Amino acid sequence: SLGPQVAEGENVFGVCHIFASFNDTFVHVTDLSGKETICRVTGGMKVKADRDESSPYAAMLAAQDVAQRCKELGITALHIKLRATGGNRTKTPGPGAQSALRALARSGMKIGRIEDVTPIPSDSTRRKGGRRGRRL
Amino acid sequence: TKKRRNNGRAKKGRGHVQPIRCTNCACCVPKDKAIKKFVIRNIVEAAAVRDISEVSVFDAYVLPKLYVKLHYCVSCAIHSKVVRNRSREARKDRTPPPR
Amino acid sequence: MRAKWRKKRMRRLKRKRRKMRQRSK
Amino acid sequence: MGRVRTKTVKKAARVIIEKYYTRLGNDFHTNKRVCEEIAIIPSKKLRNKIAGYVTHLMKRIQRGPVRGISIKLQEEERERRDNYVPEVSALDQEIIEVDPDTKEMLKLLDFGSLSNLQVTQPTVGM
Amino acid sequence: RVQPIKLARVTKVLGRTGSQGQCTQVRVEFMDDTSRSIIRNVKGPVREGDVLTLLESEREARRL
Amino acid sequence: KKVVDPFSKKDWYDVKAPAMFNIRNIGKTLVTRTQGTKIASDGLKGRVFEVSLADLQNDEVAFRKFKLITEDVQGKNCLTNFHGMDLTRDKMCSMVKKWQTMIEAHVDVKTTDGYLLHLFCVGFTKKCNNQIRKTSYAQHQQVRQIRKKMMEIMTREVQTNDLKEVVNKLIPDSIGKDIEKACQSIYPLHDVFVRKVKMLKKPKFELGKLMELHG
RNA sequence: CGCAAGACGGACCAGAGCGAAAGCAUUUGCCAAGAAUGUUUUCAUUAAUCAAGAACGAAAGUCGGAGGUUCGAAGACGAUCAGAUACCGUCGUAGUUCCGACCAUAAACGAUGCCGACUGGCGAUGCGGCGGCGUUAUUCCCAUGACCCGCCGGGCAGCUUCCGGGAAACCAAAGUCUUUGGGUUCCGGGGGGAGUAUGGUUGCAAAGCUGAAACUUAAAGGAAUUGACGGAAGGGCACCACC
RNA sequence: CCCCAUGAACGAGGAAUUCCCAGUAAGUGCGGGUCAUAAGCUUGCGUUGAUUAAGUCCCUGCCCUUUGUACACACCGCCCG
């Protein structure tokens, strides 16, 4: 956990890679390159209940931990990439999407960027549930 | 009887219309029967916006938006309540709801 | 569905009558 | 609280203020004793209500008219504005200004007097 | 959470909520900065100008 | 992986941009130390660095993201090379809306080196003059002219000129502005951007030419 | 970060277009075809509707090959439920894809034959042509494109109402109908029994077409109105309701 | 009704459920009614005297509008194999 060689005049930027997709939340802090990475925490790790894995408060507790490990290395600022769901699915933020952002900022982390990244199709393969969909 | 003069929605001069899949029902309906609601929102939902904008490495930066086009079907529209029953003398409107 | 099922049960029955007469021949 | 005044109060209140307009104060107690004397009231409690609303009407009527109730002096000033408002006679400075093809109409009325012009611009909307 | 106990005061009351009207939404100013404000859900019968004792401010609420 | 603190086994580095920007100091990365088989510098090549345009030039728009590959490592300095340009989602999305006709074309083109590129452009119809029309659309014939002229420009300017000069034209986005005026007569258009570029080949490292870019 | 395979053309895409109907949305080229409009060109009644007969005709299915991601009848499990061969979750064969042959059916619905004439208003939209005071784009132009204003054809629709019709719902056609007759094809006769029985005909198969009677019954059905009911929606209320 | 003797269950109540918002709940006594003899009942009266709410439509139920219906013996309805 040894710092970089300059961080006293400028900030160093990691990338957040928030996943939000339903029944879970990931936060996964990486390098700028993203070819290597550091600690990775889920909301399913804080609270096991098989339904609080996507909980708002579980996502807050997650980012509240992650933001420590940032400062432990030297990372102080974050570009952020969001990910809804995609893959021919809902593509709508989870409950713990708004949550984690608000939490990591107020813990004491600077914001560099924040964007949408979703792997949306340009018209592709059939979706589970058949012609009449679900109905329960 | 007939409850409509358009039956489904807008099929005029054409035979088959390409289908589309509901977002949440996951059902299958025509392109022109589905309620097509486009959506605009802020990333942070403009709720933590003051708390976010103040803490940054940039002086100013107005946040992106989240663009999603949702297609609901007959059942999944009524149940989530983006529509409701209307009077028999007032079904006939082409007018969006007041903004 | 009810009417379509009444037409279907009578389809399977009709097929059996055919089979039973074809068997005897 | 609750309680909105009934129709028996609001109906008769209007009559009593109209015909004894100049006999009302803006005090409860005076207007109470007056209603007892100028008319029968079949109860005392009923009187104490009808008086209080008669009072409440008389406050607003001195700031201009309340619909459905017409006192004399307001209908006076109504007529006084309607026989002539104070504002000048003039129609509207005694000069007419016309545009192209308004003048063409006037040729076909077989007249032509007091020419002026203002030149108009293409075209409707944009 | 385990951070020092907070104190925040009412600026305005909004209306009652819950499934029997048992909860009361209220808007509160953080009483250490008035540019910071959160909406909360409070059990008791609150009024105006009262001070509360929040055990966190990580939570942010807007209904139950 | 499973060892005690493998973040004390990493070696920091820096990542330098070519001299075509006001700010050339991109940032810092790390790879694992040189093992008895694996070696730091070879595992520090081949990366991608999505980076904003505003961040490096510091004079211009946020949208447009550039990919940069580390093609060589040299003594704690990671030299970069162009890899292809992208775009943001939101800008590209906001322009698309009902009552317009979207116009697109692409071309495959070669530089005057071993580089090969595959540019993708876009146009949108204008809400023409001060219309009282409730929509603006272009016929199918009209579109095919505009597409033909969107190919012509984007081959001419990239078939000529070497790799570095290509980059110089894409940074202010001179290319798109040129197309907007050249198609103007047959339908006026507002907006031209080159939404993607995809590099497909490259010759060799060419160490002398590499260092040309970084002075 | 790179690679492979098959599938597929989102957002732009709408009471918009084209097609005889079924149907038809990435680029470019090639091949033949067609409508509308313009026309002081040509032919001189060459037409309309149609037994026999003919072409095309979704999805599923059958036969023989190729291919096989994705989804998925069948099938095997996990739950829910008194039970649960179901709804829900996981896995998964036939099939889904393509090539070569068959199969002729659908709420193949506008539940509204085709051709022709006459009878209100208004604003739009797609295509062609015509006119014009205006702006804008390029060489200042002309040629031309974009917008603006108006007109004439034919096309998809809408709005409007004491034309008239209709049992009513509604409809510028479902109108011009006891004041009953423009041309012509197909087809109906209380509800069931029954698209069954039977013979014919077609098909490899699956089935399609044609298609009864004995016997039974006084109702079946359409539109509209008033109530009641709703594990429908919106308002409001009660310590015989709750907190 | 009185006197002396005799001296049981019961150690605060399972599943459920009732009533109540100010001199109100609860504690506590007295008069009337029935009455030859007799209130653990009912009907009135004082005295002592809190907690908790100032709401909501969640449950139970009721009023109004809109909508759907093969129901009108009115969903405790009707109807299928």
UniProtKB/TrEMBL annotation, chain F:
Keywords: Cytoplasm, Differentiation, Nucleus, Ribonucleoprotein, Ribosomal protein. One of its GO terms (cellular component) is nucleolus. It comes from the Eukaryota. It is found in: Cytoplasm; Nucleus; Nucleus, Nucleolus. GO terms for biological process: cell differentiation; translation. GO terms for molecular function: structural constituent of ribosome. May play a role during erythropoiesis through regulation of transcription factor DDIT3. Belongs to the eukaryotic ribosomal protein eS1 family. Component of the small ribosomal subunit. Mature ribosomes consist of a small (40S) and a large (60S) subunit. The 40S subunit contains about 33 different proteins and 1 molecule of RNA (18S). The 60S subunit contains about 49 different proteins and 3 molecules of RNA (28S, 5.8S and 5S). Identified in a IGF2BP1-dependent mRNP granule complex containing untranslated mRNAs. Binds with high affinity to IPO4. Interacts with DDIT3. Part of the small subunit (SSU) processome, composed of more than 70 proteins and the RNA chaperone small nucleolar RNA (snoRNA) U3. This is Small ribosomal subunit protein eS1. The chain holds residues 19 to 233 of 264 of the full protein.
